[PDB]
Design a protein around this ligand. Sequence first.
Ligand SMILES: [Mg+2]
Ligand SMILES: [Mg+2]
Ligand SMILES: [Mg+2]
Ligand SMILES: [Mg+2]
Ligand SMILES: [Mg+2]
Ligand SMILES: [Mg+2]
Ligand SMILES: [Mg+2]
Ligand SMILES: [Mg+2]
Ligand SMILES: [Mg+2]
Ligand SMILES: [Mg+2]
Ligand SMILES: [Mg+2]
Lengths: 213, 238, 217, 234, 202, 233, 245, 220, 204
Amino acid sequence: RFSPYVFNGGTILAIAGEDFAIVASDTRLSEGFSIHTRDSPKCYKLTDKTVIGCSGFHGDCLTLTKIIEARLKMYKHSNNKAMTTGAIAAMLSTILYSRRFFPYYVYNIIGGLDEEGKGAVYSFDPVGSYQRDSFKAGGSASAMLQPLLDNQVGFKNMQNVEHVPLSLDRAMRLVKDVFISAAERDVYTGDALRICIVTKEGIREETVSLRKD
Amino acid sequence: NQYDNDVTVWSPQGRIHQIEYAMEAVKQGSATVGLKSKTHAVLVALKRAQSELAAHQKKILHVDNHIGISIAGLTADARLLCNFMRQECLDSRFVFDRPLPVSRLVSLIGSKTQIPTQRYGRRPYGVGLLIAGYDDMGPHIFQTCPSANYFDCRAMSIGARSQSARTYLERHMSEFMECNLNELVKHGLRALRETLPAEQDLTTKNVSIGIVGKDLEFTIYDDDDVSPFLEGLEERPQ
Amino acid sequence: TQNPMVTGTSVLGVKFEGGVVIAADMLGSYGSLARFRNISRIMRVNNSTMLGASGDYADFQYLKQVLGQMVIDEELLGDGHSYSPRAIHSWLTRAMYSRRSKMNPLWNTMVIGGYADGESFLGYVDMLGVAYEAPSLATGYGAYLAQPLLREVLEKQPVLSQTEARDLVERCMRVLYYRDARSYNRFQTATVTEKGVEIEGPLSTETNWDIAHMISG
Amino acid sequence: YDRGVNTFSPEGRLFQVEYDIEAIKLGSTAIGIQTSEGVCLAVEKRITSPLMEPSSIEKIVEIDAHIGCAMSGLIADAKTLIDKARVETQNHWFTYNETMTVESVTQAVSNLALQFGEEDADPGAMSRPFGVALLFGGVDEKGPQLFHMDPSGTFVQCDARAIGSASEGAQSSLQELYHKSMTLKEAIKSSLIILKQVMEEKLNATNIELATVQPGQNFHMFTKEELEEVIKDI
Amino acid sequence: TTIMAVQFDGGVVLGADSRTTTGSYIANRVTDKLTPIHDRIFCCRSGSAADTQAVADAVTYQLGFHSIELNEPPLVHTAASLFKEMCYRYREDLMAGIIIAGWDPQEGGQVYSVPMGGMMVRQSFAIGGSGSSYIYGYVDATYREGMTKEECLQFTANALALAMERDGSSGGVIRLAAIAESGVERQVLLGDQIPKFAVATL
Amino acid sequence: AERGYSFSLTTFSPSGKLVQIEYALAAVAGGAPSVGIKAANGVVLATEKKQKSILYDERSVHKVEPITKHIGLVYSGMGPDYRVLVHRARKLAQQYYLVYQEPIPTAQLVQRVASVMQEYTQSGGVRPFGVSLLICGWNEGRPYLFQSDPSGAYFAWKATAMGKNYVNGKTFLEKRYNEDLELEDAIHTAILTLKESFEGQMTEDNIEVGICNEAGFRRLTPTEVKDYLAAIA
Amino acid sequence: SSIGTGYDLSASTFSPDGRVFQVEYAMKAVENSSTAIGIRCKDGVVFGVEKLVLSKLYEEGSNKRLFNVDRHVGMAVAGLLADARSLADIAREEASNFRSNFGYNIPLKHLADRVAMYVHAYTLYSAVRPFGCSFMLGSYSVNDGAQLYMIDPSGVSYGYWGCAIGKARQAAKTEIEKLQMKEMTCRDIVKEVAKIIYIVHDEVKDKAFELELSWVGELTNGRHEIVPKDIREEAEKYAKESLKE
Amino acid sequence: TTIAGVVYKDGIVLGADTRATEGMVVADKNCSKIHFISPNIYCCGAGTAADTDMTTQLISSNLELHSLSTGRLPRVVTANRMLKQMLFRYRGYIGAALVLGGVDVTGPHLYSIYPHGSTDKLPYVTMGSGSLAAMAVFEDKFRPDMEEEEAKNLVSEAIAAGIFNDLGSGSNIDLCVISKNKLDFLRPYTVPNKKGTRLGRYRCEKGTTAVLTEKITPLE
Amino acid sequence: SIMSYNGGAVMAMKGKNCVAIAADRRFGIQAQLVTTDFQKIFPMGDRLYIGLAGLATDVQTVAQRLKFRLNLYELKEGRQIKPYTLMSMVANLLYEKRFGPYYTEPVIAGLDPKTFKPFICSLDLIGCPMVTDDFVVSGTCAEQMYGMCESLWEPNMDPDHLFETISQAMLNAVDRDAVSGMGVIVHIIEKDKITTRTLKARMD
Ligand SMILES: [Mg+2]
Ligand SMILES: [Mg+2]
Ligand SMILES: [Mg+2]
Ligand SMILES: [Mg+2]
Ligand SMILES: [Mg+2]
Ligand SMILES: [Mg+2]
Ligand SMILES: [Mg+2]
Ligand SMILES: [Mg+2]
Ligand SMILES: [Mg+2]
Ligand SMILES: [Mg+2]
Ligand SMILES: [Mg+2]
């Protein structure tokens, strides 16, 4: 007949530390058993301290992204200030709910800093249900990345361990590892891995390489 | 007075008083000035305060990254038009992912504000506008009036006693195009000062500046932020 | 459109130094019937952007109608402003997505080719609204037969010349003819450069059938 | 002389909007002052009879925990604007999960500004402006703030402001007493001192409303007693 | 059904069978599938009788007004456009396979095809309808550039004859019509008049 | 682009009168006269078809119109308004028949059209119809004759007149004829009451007449007219 | 004749002597405007306008009184500009819808009759007011040749060889009759257009001014374009020099 | 149902069986299937009885309103147009199959209209479940310009073929002849079906039915 | 099927100068009886009755809405509805729901209000009418009822030989239909009187 949806794959991950937030995603865009492009990162800058990653149906991610952008401009003209990471998250929730009966097939993850300067991460389901987390991943590799983080970043299942804070350095390598391991088992993950780091200084990008197969 | 109350009534002289009256609303508003070099568009305006305990009125508003405006006339109408202008811009970026060409935005204000001037029971928008923007055709300064008419300007000024400012601008036009920002802004501040009673001038409390240009997104300056421009202003009236 | 009728097969697009090139056979299929053998599935959208469409030809004609009016409209203003390749590609994505969201899609996959500001533009657009930019594009079967060749070449030489590129397109348009059962060895080649948009008349490719004589051996 | 409600005068001003500004001058007087430690709002109820419950007269209301508002003029009209405001603050909270600034709230209300007309209009459309003047007092990310808004749709921030019949006089006094460094304690005293002057009746603790909003405490409508306490220092 | 149109210098030739069935029962063996749209413009219809009839009346109405309003002979391309507009717009609710051919003081003789989808394309000669599938090879090997109003008029007679022979959905009598500046002349080919081809034997 | 006046153009004056309605009647009293007679076995309608020049083709237009197979009409007043009401009556006549399968009872058709005429005395943006009608019919044995005027009010008459000299034309009939009059009889006393004002040479093209017996309604031809004219037939 | 006792407030009211004063009043607005002229050469149509210098602060090109209504049709206006511009949008829309429907460029006679009926629609009710403007439509094609039309506030539309609207409608005509356009080429008419403009222009009352020239004919390839600065200057010089005589 | 019409030298003849069925049971042994449009126009209806009624009644009603204004007599193309454009608009949901026939200023016209809205202009047509049976009679014995009686019976012969060969048709054969000056609406034209003569007696004699309650009421 | 949800039977017969109409009395929902005193025949003026079979809700609704129309008709017109006209009135009411019809096939029985003329007819759930000179049936036992009728009806019948005839048709038809019955009621209308009897019948 005609489906108005497609699965393009790609995963998205994010972690929040005392003073930083990280948002990562592979860069492969596929459909069927093919690859549309190897250079299509799912991370996008919303403000100077808020980044969003979208996975699922690219048609919806694109539309959603442009809707968010416009609404921030509106908020700015209206209140004379930029939107705080928390308000953007609250808004995205209602935007997703407006399509409750014809969902945006999309899994979004917001990574940034809260007004208090600390790191923040919000995860959403296609219709707006959300919450804040220390770290979370969505997308195909979703179930591949998570477990390692529950262990490494959450010190779960480990007896007598040192609950040391996620040093931005250790984080950055955890991110690269799970994505490199995932790139090994999920046919959707591969090509490259772009990371976006959000701190008091701004947003900095880094692109690591992945298997092109 | 049979020809004064409805914009659908032409006078035996081929005029529409309601339109003219609305134009009067502009004249009442405090004066504002606009001018552009070949790389920057600048808006300058004088803000008024009801009483001494009240703040000064906004006169410059942000439309989009490449467009800003100054207003004179009914404030409520300014907000209507501003929001229309903002909406039209958001739509451009949404559909075309590019900023709305300033001249095209001006044509829309022209079409939108013309409609009510021709229908019974409706009234002309009661506000004038100086528009400062920057598109792939460079800097621009437009003027729009209660009559759906609009103008492409080298420099301009509307409002109370704006006749002086116009005069000052008409004298130093040739200079504008090659001015560097701060000089361009000064000419603006200088022209505005022309519209004031000799026994008073520009304060960091009553001046507002708007700048957009190849090197900068439309930005507004209001209080301490205005000092940097006021400094180096020859208190040499002329 | 809920059921495509007369359709066009794959469409190719690769960019080179100072321009982009697109290729599309001139076939309008009706199921398995090569029904309309001489129709253009390429269009010139103003001086810096061109478009190629796979899918329902009727819908494509429609887009061609709306896009033509749009360009005309803009030209009337002669205000020194004109849609860029990215702009046309952006609009198309909004359009295709809008229709997909009304459950009444325009059954096309399109390749937008453009050149503006010394940079090359090449964009993809689904009937579902999936859109993206890339150095090489191939829709339909071309995505299984042509894109692997195109990438192969570019992973070893990112920069081609209008000639090196046209050489690749011809090679691909041959592979497509050999393997896509709904292709026609009679295509067009459109090119965009600082000079503009150029479309080349009915072309064909040398085909080699010497393996046919290897039945027994 | 009969013309449309959206007609301009030769002076470039809408007759209706001018004619309602006039109506405000017939309302009771209210004062609002803004201090770094909070904002206060005071208004004379202007009781017209002993048989009328002084309490069933609210010229000062809560918009939201961080925002209070005082009115003057055709109070029936203010009912509507007040509700739109409360509803607006909640839509903002619903959508963005954060409180709305005092400026944005005032602005939201101001957009219903000249939203009146006859022809080319919906059925549930206003046919005339609201004959009301308002004072939005509250505290937000930018500290304590006071805003004034009249029927023209214009609104602005004020360190201190007065509306109503005694407005002219009241504002004169406020200009004499305001200190960029005074306090919420000093502020409230001035308000009542001035309010006492302008009122035609002797200032009772039952013929005035006083409320404050401070960086810590959420909107508070002074009690009959708390008034006695401040009035004690006539 | 089997419809066909050919372009020759100063005009066009149009042909169609006369069979219209509902299932396997012929409800009309003498149908007139060539409909006049305007003084010198005709269309051949295939598909839903109700749809093609309803659409043609609509275009005739549309075109008749357009010409009086311009006080000029309408373009053949315009008539094609009006069919294409309705057939594209309501493509999901119509089952119409149309061919528009006629004479234009400005473009001369022309033939346009507007198949199921709603697309429109100009052609030297066009064929449509169920029976059309059996005469492609024929028509491809027989069409000659430069034929005469006579060669053409005979060329479609053969194609329609062949097609009518093999397609159950086609048959009856062959109707023709030639249009050129001078005007329009319509003829019919009953029984024997219909080209014949010997059925292969021993 | 057009809007519409939603306020009524007819309104009570302090005298309690509905001015526009009176004035409408004035347009009536100033129109070509019409006579209607209920002969207890068929009704007759006749009016003065005064055409200016001889250039007018008396044929092309009629004033005595058939509503249904058994109903008929004539008016006194503004011709264009009439025409409107004729199309609406004929229409009302069909909406009845489709539902009931029985031709519409004359009294019922009158009621329905009267309601329309009344509508134009209260609805916004309009003026009352400047016309008065005389409806005649054979519904269920008995013949009927009615008159409805601008106000939308109607009455049943044994016979009457409207238009110029309707005052004299009435009084004349108020005696110059009575019930029990058979067919052709009522027709004569009708064309006569007409001449009681018809200034000029009342010929077979200066008048038009229709009759409604319990066997359908029809218009009489110039022949049957030229006849009755010779003071008999 | 001073008629106007309520009989001149609504377009939906006839005066006791059969006139619609609102429309007449709208025309005055036009008679007070600056002159614009159109002349059908043998291979196209040429447009010229006396665009008065409102202020030296305005850019050259501000308040243009000539627009492209379709790629093959030009529009020259006089009167209330804002009214004219909306009529230009309508013309454009009309020409665009036509192509979408019938599939070919709109015939100038039709685009003119269409817009004219839209203008006329505004002279029947109290709900709206007549456009205070007049305009000319010019086009060229090989199958239609050159065509020049002019519509006014009443809706009336006609074809011309030459025509003028504005302050000096009359003065401009007596000068156009001196040319034999029917045989003249567009490239030569530019000069004559600019000529008739300076003649008619009032050096006294109306201060400084600018000249706007429109192009459309075999010389432009059917596309209505602005006249090249080069041709304009030449035509300005010729006009100025011919003035000193 | 079997309905048919033929075009002969002086005019037109319409035929029609008279059976109506609710499933495979006969509800009406005498349904009137030839409907009146105008005095010179008649229409036979097959399909959904109710639909055949109301559409036929509406077009009739609309034509009486039409000729009541033009002052002229209705044309067949007009009935054909009105009918087809309505049916088409309902995409087949108004199940009306019609055989339209009448005489114009332009002559006798015979059209066949299908529920989806297409029409056929033909010298002889049939509709209904018995249409193939009837059409056989025509195809085998049809001649142009037949005389009234020579057609008037070809039609009763085709409506007969239907009646016996189609379980959906039975009872009487009604006819309708319309010529430049005549309109013979022959209701029973033929009656080739009679209920078999009752061979026994069952008359219920007063008192045989036991009653449980009685109650009378006098009228006036 | 929807029609046989509540079950039911209705019949009308034509005598010389009289008319009869009877109906079972059961009101059930599938297999289960719910009521024994269910009205299915409604008075629509003196000497005019309508009998409704089919789906219980629409029976009640079609009747109530028909009364609505019948009353006004009689208040506007200055008379009492004529049978052929009430039939056309119901034919209109039902067809206004052509694409979402009421599930009931009515039966009309009566005498001309100003004449002897006996009149009977039945209709489609969509308003197609049928008039006959003998009888008409409606309900879940159309077949059984036709059986009796084609074997018991005689051209002319006095009120009593009509009552005994229609009473036998019902009771016997209704006794070979599982969802019709629980008692039968008969109405015999004569220019002078209205005899209403509830026959003795099975209650299973
Ligand atoms: Mg589908
Ligand atoms: Mg990307
Ligand atoms: Mg792989
Ligand atoms: Mg008269
Ligand atoms: Mg006019
Ligand atoms: Mg000259
Ligand atoms: Mg030119
Ligand atoms: Mg049978
Ligand atoms: Mg009774
Ligand atoms: Mg039972
Ligand atoms: Mg039981």
